[PDB]
Design a protein around this ligand. Structure first.
Ligand SMILES: Cc1nc2cc(-c3ccccc3)nn2c(-c2cc(F)c3c(c2C)CCCO3)c1[C@H](OC(C)(C)C)C(=O)O
Length: 266
């Protein structure tokens, strides 16, 4: 029941996701591990499990700043995959390089959380990242509530990838010049998601699924703002961000974002 243009739009997004989402984290290598002012303290509860290909397990039970290098490496690895995702998309590729930088700076965290939700096991409170597992030791925390609520919707791969496109093509991110072009693209991804749900879901039980997804995207944008401000405060008193994170989080747009500009021309 989708139009031919809507099916091609989904095909292109699914192609891009398959090529750029390392779901088994088998290429996440050479990362740092935890070794063997007042607001930044409040700004900072999981165990890390590293399964060896031989059976052996290394587990890290936490006691603050000792997890930051590892998190910076995982985030940077995820952000590289999200930049590669946006590059594969023709609608993104045809935008001016400055608007490409602006959209990625605005959506990097949101797209990373959407991809992390696909590996989140809500029954065990664990993000299953291939041989790495981040297990909640223990709904009040907005980011946790978001992962539990999104997982509960039991979305298809197509719905997650349309959520990524809707979040990526946000016309109101700081620095966006082609507001009307990006707004038209976002509207067509949202209409495509709405049509996909009408055509593929048994009508009554999924009657408001599209609205629930759009509400989750609104909540995600709000959490993104809280995360960015928390990160800048931590970075200000204890530097940890990698050069790519510094560019994405704001720590002549092509001159200020040379790593991003290089990654986009590759
Ligand atoms: C609040 C917060 N506390 C902590 C704490 C530890 C941590 C990591 C290793 C050992 C001990 C503690 N990790 N960790 C993370 C964290 C970070 C990541 F990169 C990441 C993952 C998570 C859990 C899971 C998938 C792999 O990637 C977060 C936040 O994660 C969410 C937004 C909630 C997802 C965040 O992004 O700050």
């Amino acid at each position: 029941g989708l139009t031919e243009e809507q099916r091609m739009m989904i095909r292109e997004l699914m192609d891009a996701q398959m090529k750029t989402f390392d779901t088994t984290f088998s290429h996440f290598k050479n990362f740092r591990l935890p070794g063997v002012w007042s607001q930044v303290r409040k700004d900072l509860k999981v165990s890390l499990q590293l399964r060896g290909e031989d059976g052996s397990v290394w587990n890290y039970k936490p006691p603050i700043f000792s997890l930051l290098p590892h998190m910076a490496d995982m985030s940077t690895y995820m952000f590289k995959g999200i930049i590669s995702f946006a590059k594969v998309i023709s609608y993104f590729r045809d935008l001016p390089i400055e608007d490409q930088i602006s959209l990625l700076k605005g959506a990097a965290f949101e797209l990373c959380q959407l991809r992390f939700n696909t590996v989140f096991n809500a029954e065990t409170g664990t993000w299953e990242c291939g041989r790495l597992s981040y297990c909640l030791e223990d709904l009040l925390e907005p980011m946790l509530k978001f992962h539990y609520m999104l997982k509960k919707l039991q979305l298809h791969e197509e719905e997650y990838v349309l959520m990524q496109a809707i979040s990526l093509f946000s016309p109101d991110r700081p620095g966006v010049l082609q507001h009307r072009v990006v707004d038209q693209l976002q509207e067509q991804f949202a209409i495509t998601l709405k049509s996909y749900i009408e055509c593929n879901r048994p009508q009554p039980a999924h009657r408001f699924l599209f609205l629930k997804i759009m509400a989750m995207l609104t909540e995600l944008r709000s959490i993104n703002a809280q995360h960015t401000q928390r990160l800048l405060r931590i970075q200000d008193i204890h530097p940890f961000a990698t050069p790519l994170m510094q560019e994405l989080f704001g720590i002549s747009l092509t001159e200020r974002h040379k790593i991003l500009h290089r990654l986009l021309q590759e």
